[PDB]
């Protein structure tokens, strides 16, 4: 890598790994549209397996960017509309509180207080219907944002219904395959287990547990190379040959709601660039309800934006950020769920230096 990139990356990440006691980490920097890779430490401490460019990390909530783009692709295909009532795709969802809740609200966490987590006890399709029928919103739709897997997770499940495909098959056929993300998975095949890093929580090796709507909300595993390809695809949607996928990426980066200096897209979140780390900045808060202002109509993807998404699972911490106008981006994958502010600070330090 150019010495400038090598130096800012190593000088930023080495201390981060030391301070946060991260077992293993992979970073990709996209500079002038070309990727540069860096790896440190261990994917499996006990078996002494190093992190490599082929190591699979759990993406956690960064998975929601794939769900948002798959949804965008379904809108582009004419299969669904964000303005459509949730009940159009799930007629059995007859409880009155669902009147007025559209797919847009599900995708952007504005349905009225859907919870962060789908309960453990909810597994089957009948259990899930019961959970949503019983849910009581705290707020009217489109008034407050509360980040939630049960919200964007339901959006993903409904968005693929008209296609006839399972969520995993739709994601594979419509997103992963066209973009050549051939080492990105919702379910890690046995052939790829040799590359699946262990996550570490309180020093114990752990992998994400199955749960309802996991694939749609937090279940993607990927390598640093495929994630760099994902950032390039989101930096330059026009180089993508598949027409509806190109549009879908664009729709996911549209600004639908504003809270403070932040704008909510489909999966992706955005701030106007330039921005300071203090404004970009947090997982220390378990539930953060914020009023939202609708952007009527949504602003098409703004190139001068800091576009990003954090992700965590019990044993992993991920972060992706890119600035379209500068053809610049970064992916940070780690097998420890360490504080979001430290991720944002490192990413900002690196991208600001490469401006
Ligand atoms: O398996 C749970 C799964 O949900 C996430 C969010 O996608 O974590 C939430 O639930 C955990 C278990 O209840 C909490 O410890 C965590 O703080 C909460 O965000 C993922 O992190 C996790 O893989």
Those residues with Cβ within 8 angstroms of residue 30's Cβ, 6 or more apart along the chain or in another chain: 36, 228, 231, 232, 235, 322, 327, 328, 329, 330
Closest-CA residue to 114 (of 95, 100, 94, 134): 134
Which ligand 1 atom is nearest residue 58's CA?
23
Q: What is the DSSP string of 8-40?
A: HHHHHHHHHHHHHT-SEEEEEEEETTEEEEEEE
CA of 32 to the centre of ligand 1 (A): 35
Report resolution (Å) to 1 decimal: 1.5
Contact 352, 248 (CB under 8 A): no
Contact 111, 105 (CB under 8 A): yes
Domain 1-355 has CATH 3.40.50.300: no
Whether 60 is in the pocket of ligand 1, judged by its Cβ within 6 Å, is yes
Contact 332, 312 (CB under 8 A): no
Question: Does an H or E element contain 258, and which?
Answer: strand 255-259
Q: What is the DSSP string of 286-311?
A: S---EE-EEEEEEEP--SSEEEEEEE
Closest-CA residue to 103 (of 127, 79, 126, 87): 87
CA of 24 to the centre of ligand 1 (A): 21
Spatial distance between the Cα atoms of 192 and 55, rounded to a whole number of angstroms: 9
**Vertex 172: Cα angle to 103 and 146 (nearest 5):** 30
Which ligand 1 atom is nearest residue 209's CA?
1
Contact 108, 266 (CB under 8 A): yes
β-strand 269-272 against 290-291: which pairing, if any? unpaired
Torsion of CA 288, 291, 295, 301, to 10 degrees: -10
Whether 151 is in the pocket of ligand 1, judged by its Cβ within 6 Å, is no
């Amino acid at each position: 890598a150019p010495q400038q990139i090598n130096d800012i990356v190593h000088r930023t990440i080495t201390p981060l790994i030391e301070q946060q006691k991260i077992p293993g980490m992979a970073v990709a920097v996209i500079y002038q549209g070309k990727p540069y890779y860096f790896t440190w430490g261990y994917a499996d401490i006990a078996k002494k397996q190093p992190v490599t460019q082929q190591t699979l990390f759990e993406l956690g909530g960064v998975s929601k960017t794939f769900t948002g783009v798959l949804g965008g692709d379904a809108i582009a295909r004419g299969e669904i509309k964000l303005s459509d009532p949730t009940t159009k795709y799930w007629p059995e969802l007859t409880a009155k509180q669902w009147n007025g809740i559209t797919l847009l609200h599900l995708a952007t966490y504005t349905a009225g207080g859907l919870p962060l987590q789908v309960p453990d006890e909810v597994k089957s399709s009948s259990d899930l219907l019961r959970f949503y029928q019983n849910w009581q919103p705290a707020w009217a739709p489109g008034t407050q944002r509360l980040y939630a897997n049960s919200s964007i997770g339901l959006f993903g499940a409904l968005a693929v219904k008209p296609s006839g495909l399972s969520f995993e098959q739709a994601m594979q056929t419509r997103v992963f395959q066209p973009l050549k993300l051939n080492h990105t998975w919702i379910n890690v095949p046995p052939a790829e287990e040799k590359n699946y890093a262990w996550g570490y929580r309180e020093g114990k090796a752990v992998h994400v547990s199955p749960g309802a709507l996991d694939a749609e909300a937090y279940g993607v595993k990927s390598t640093i190379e495929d994630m760099a390809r994902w950032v390039q695809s989101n930096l330059k949607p026009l180089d993508i040959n598949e027409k509806t996928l190109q549009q879908g990426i664009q729709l996911a980066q549209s600004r639908y709601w504003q809270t403070g200096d932040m704008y909510q897209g489909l999966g992706w979140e955005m701030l106007d660039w330039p921005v300071n780390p203090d404004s970009i900045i947090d997982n220390k808060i378990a539930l953060a309800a914020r009023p939202v202002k609708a952007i009527t109509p949504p602003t098409p993807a703004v190139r001068a934006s800091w576009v990003h998404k954090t992700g965590a699972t019990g044993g992993f911490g991920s972060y992706v950020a890119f600035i379209p106008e500068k053809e610049l981006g970064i992916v940070m994958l780690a097998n420890k769920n360490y504080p979001n502010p430290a991720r944002v600070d490192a990413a900002w330090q690196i991208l600001n230096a490469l401006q």
